[PDB]
């Protein structure tokens, strides 16, 4: 009654048209521009798990790089449904609701209460291998180039800011490895052990080796090429999200001069190599048309 | 039955223990129980740890005493009237260090 005219709303800017246009639901993962166009697996395991699960759910979606700040929660791998009106969009879907949004045949094998024994084996993946990956990436001087060109270089393009981003990444990973009592349990003043001086790394490496041996021995008794069932589930995706990246980015042939055979060769040779066969059988159910893995 | 002391965040356990452990030695003779709780919460005020505005005591079913710490640092200028015409001072107090201790500076 009070306003007199209405005039065809104001046509959002260019960035809000080249990025958030969409036709398919888009999943925001830690990726790179050269890889996001092909849907190739991300380089962060916490996002590669959900990307693998969504690809197994036969969902048609798109992959766009993001930066962990634009999330409905703290962590990154969220999803945004397609835009229905050029000035309004549905709400985002956090990492927990990706499988609920995914619904073809049966989306029941991708979310299921694991048997009690499997809940014990899953701690090997979520703590042992995770702390191994965090120590080997964020606190190993050999992988400074990887850490930079993956997480820091495409963020700010400014040395005095890349420095602070690297520092905070390294400190935040040290604050996490220094909590799991596999390798770090030191007690200092009322502040976490936020440095590689309290994350003693031989224990972490040995825990990772034992975890990989145990997981290979668990896979050996399945008889159906997966972890007890017929099609890969959440356990297979959770293990893939670490073994694939360990084989890809941490398989450096420099080992003899230092010892401590890298994580990728540990994954390749663990047990009778059942883990490599597993990761190559998952690359062929989710990514059946992608070649050029194994470094 | 069971008594608690809510809000005594910076008071040592053995001090409140010396005060409130004999209170549980009254083994329904409600009168004597109330007299002992009153005597205890009164002796608790003869220290200078915490204020006197909120000495709550709740009974149920058992006992629940609510207290609120006074402060940890106090400053002042004031003006003293110690037999003289006037005296400007700067009184810096530290109300509690470990137990019920203090430390002034005038």
């Amino acid at each position: 009654y009070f306003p007199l005219r209405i005039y065809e709303p104001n046509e959002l800017p260019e960035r809000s048209q080249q990025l958030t246009s969409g036709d398919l639901p888009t999943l925001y993962v830690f990726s790179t521009d050269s890889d996001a166009r092909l849907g190739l697996p991300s380089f962060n395991p916490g996002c590669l798990k959900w990307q693998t699960l969504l690809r197994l759910a036969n969902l048609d979606f798109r992959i766009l790089p993001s930066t962990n700040h634009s999330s409905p929660t703290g962590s990154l791998p969220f999803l945004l449904p397609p835009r229905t009106s050029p000035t309004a969009s549905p709400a985002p879907i956090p990492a927990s609701g990706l499988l609920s949004f995914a619904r073809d045949l049966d989306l029941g094998h991708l979310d299921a209460d694991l048997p009690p024994r499997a809940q014990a084996y899953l701690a090997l993946i979520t703590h042992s291998l995770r702390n191994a990956w965090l120590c080997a990436l964020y606190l190993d001087p050999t992988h400074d180039a990887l850490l930079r060109r993956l997480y820091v270089d495409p963020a700010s393009s400014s040395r005095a800011v890349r420095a602070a981003l690297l520092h905070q990444l390294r400190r935040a990973a040290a604050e996490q490895v220094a909590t799991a009592s596999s390798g770090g349990g030191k007690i200092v003043s009322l502040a976490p052990v936020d440095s590689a001086d309290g994350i003693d790394e031989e224990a972490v490496y040995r825990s990772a080796r034992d975890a990989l041996d145990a997981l290979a021995s668990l896979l050996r008794e399945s008889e159906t090429a997966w972890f007890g069932t017929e099609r890969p589930g959440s356990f297979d995706a959770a293990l893939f999200s670490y073994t694939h990246l360990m084989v890809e980015y941490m398989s450096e042939e420099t080992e003899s001069a230092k010892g401590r055979v890298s994580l990728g060769r540990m994954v390749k040779e663990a047990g009778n190599g059942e883990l490599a066969e597993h990761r190559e059988r998952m690359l062929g159910v989710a990514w059946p048309e992608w070649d050029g893995y194994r470094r | 039955s069971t008594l608690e002391v809510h809000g005594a965040t910076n008071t040592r356990r053995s001090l409140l223990d010396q005060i409130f452990k004999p209170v549980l030695e009254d083994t329904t003779t409600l009168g004597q129980v109330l007299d002992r709780v009153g005597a205890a919460t009164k002796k608790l005020a003869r220290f200078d740890i915490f204020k006197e505005e909120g000495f709550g005591v709740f009974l149920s079913e058992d006992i629940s005493i609510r207290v609120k710490e006074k402060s940890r640092l106090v400053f002042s200028a004031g003006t003293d009237f110690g037999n003289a015409e006037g005296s400007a001072y700067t009184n810096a107090v530290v109300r509690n260090i470990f137990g019920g201790a203090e430390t002034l500076t005038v």
Partner: protein, 346 residues
């Protein structure tokens, strides 16, 4: 350099906490290590020195000291790595990794986060095993650590009791099928993992705990774990664990070799120096680097010589702050005079 792996050149003595609950120790890692040593070596091989994180270079309490090679080894898993069908070892590793996390946050929910149990049961038991000025610095650090560890459970000092029951059952249902002590039953695992299971479960169900919800859950729904804990304690630690070969005169006589007034004053002064904001942050980092280099040297490797950049940075921050403060408060001597006279030249 403080955020990367270190650079290299081109008769055991277990350290534990005090008994404090009717068990040989607290901190179920230490108790599991004691139970492991007691079943493997024999009374004439270990010494069980009572200690605290300030008295070892590892800063981690289940610390063994080999006397033949003078190597420091911290943590339970590293200790049992030292001193030493495939589904047995597989399940051993699986359950060790499931106890070290998802059971340590549950034991730290009681006794550490609930302020009714910390102060009534736990804090006195920590103060009773530490030299006199230390109970003001170390028990709060241990509580802060075990409260940061018990996070991710979404719980705090808070009908809001069905949720604690669910959180405890989600763990005790995984532990319940292991057949923790028998010659027949479910899935036998190993000795070294049974001892860790005993450590955690016995510290879960035994203490007094004014608000004992965990003891109630364990005794009400899981009788197998209660029976296992009782029989294991009666078999390995008869009579409270006083027959364990502690140092010269028992438990309290063990904190004598490294509890002189000098060392205790040093420990207190370091623990209080680590709390001044900036200087303390960087002092803690430098001290931890020094101690890790010391442990590594004792292990047998040759670390990088030293990098005092951390202490230089902390001292620089402190000295620069105080110098700017003084230079801008007191200043410099006056730049002018009371009278200044000009006069034309001729």
């Amino acid at each position: 350099s403080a955020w990367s792996h270190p650079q290299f050149e081109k008769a055991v003595q277990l350290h534990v906490w005090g008994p404090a609950f009717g068990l040989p120790s607290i901190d179920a890692e230490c108790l599991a290590a004691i139970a492991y040593l007691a079943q493997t070596l024999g009374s004439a091989d270990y010494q069980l020195i009572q200690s605290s994180p300030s008295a070892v270079p590892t800063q981690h309490l289940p610390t063994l000291y080999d006397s033949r090679t003078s190597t420091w080894i911290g943590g339970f898993t590293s200790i049992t790595a030292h001193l030493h069908a495939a589904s047995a070892t597989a399940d051993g590793t699986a359950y060790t990794a499931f106890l070290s996390a998802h059971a340590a946050p549950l034991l730290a929910l009681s006794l550490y986060v609930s302020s009714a149990n910390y102060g009534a049961a736990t804090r006195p038991a920590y103060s009773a095993v530490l030299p006199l000025p230390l109970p003001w610095t170390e028990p709060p650090a241990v509580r802060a650590a075990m409260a940061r560890r018990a996070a991710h459970l979404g719980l705090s000092s808070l009908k809001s009791r069905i949720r604690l029951e669910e959180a405890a059952r989600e763990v005790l249902d995984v532990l319940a099928e292991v057949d923790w002590a028998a010659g027949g039953g479910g899935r036998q695992v190993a000795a070294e993992v049974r001892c860790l299971a005993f450590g955690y479960l016995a510290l879960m169900l035994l203490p007094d705990v004014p608000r004992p919800w965990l003891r109630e859950i364990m005794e009400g729904r899981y009788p197998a774990l209660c029976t296992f804990v009782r029989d294991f304690r009666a078999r390995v630690f008869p009579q409270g664990g006083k027959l364990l070969p502690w140092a010269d005169g028992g438990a309290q006589a063990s904190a004598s070799a490294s509890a002189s007034a000098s060392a205790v004053a040093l420990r207190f002064v370091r623990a209080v120096m680590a709390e001044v904001p900036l200087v303390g942050e960087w002092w803690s980092r430098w001290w931890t680097a020094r101690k890790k280099r010391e442990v590594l040297a004792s292990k047998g490797a040759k670390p990088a010589p030293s990098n005092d950049l951390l202490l230089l940075l902390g001292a620089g921050l402190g000295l620069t702050v105080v110098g700017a403060g003084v230079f801008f408060y007191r200043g410099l001597p006056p730049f002018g005079e009371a009278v200044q006279v000009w006069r034309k030249p001729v």
